[PDB]
């Protein structure tokens, strides 16, 4: 739940190296 | 500067069923003043609409611009209306009374 949202979205919002 | 088949009344199909009248009004007032709107009700006419604008240029540039608009997973198919028949008599009594008003008021004869 909590760690899921935290780490998941912190990875998504920097997952594309070109942006 | 218009081709005569231009009308201030156009025929629209490919609408979403049951589409919200307010949407209808502003979607179409992305061009100007809407004099009137009719949506079909019997299932055969369900999903299409006659739209009566109050300005020639409004209606025409609407038919220029929106034709080829996609909302609700379908392109809005439009055409000009051919108001080529009448559907009931033009009511002589009130007609002559309002023109009698015209003449009584403005003193022509």
């Amino acid at each position: 739940x909590x760690x899921x949202x935290x780490x998941x979205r912190x990875x998504x919002x920097x997952x594309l190296p070109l942006x | 500067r218009l081709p005569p088949e231009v009308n201030r009344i156009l025929y629209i199909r490919n609408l979403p069923y049951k589409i919200t009248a307010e949407e209808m009004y502003d979607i179409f007032g992305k061009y100007g003043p809407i004099r009137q709107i009719r949506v079909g009700n019997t299932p055969e006419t369900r999903g299409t609409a006659y739209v009566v604008y109050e300005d020639i240029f409004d209606a025409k540039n609407a038919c220029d611009h929106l034709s080829g608009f996609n909302v609700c997973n379908r392109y809005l198919v439009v055409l000009y209306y051919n108001a080529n028949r009448a559907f009931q008599k033009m009511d002589t009594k009130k007609k002559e009374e309002q023109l009698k008003l015209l003449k009584e008021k403005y003193g022509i004869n």
Partner: protein
């Protein structure tokens, strides 16, 4: 022409039997990399050709 079509029949049957040759990680890396490219170029997809289309 006949010898080539014998060989090509065999290539297609071998494909269906020995499976797809692009593994799964290779396919996913290719797919994801393409997605990243297009998203950084702000490409917008070509839509299906409308009926009321000008051209």
């Amino acid at each position: 022409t006949r010898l080539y079509l014998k060989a090509e029949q065999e290539r297609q049957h071998n494909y269906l039997k020995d499976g797809p040759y692009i593994t799964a990680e290779e396919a996913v890396a290719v797919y994801t990399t393409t997605v990243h490219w297009l998203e950084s170029r702000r490409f917008s997809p070509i839509p299906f050709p409308p009926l009321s289309y000008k051209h």
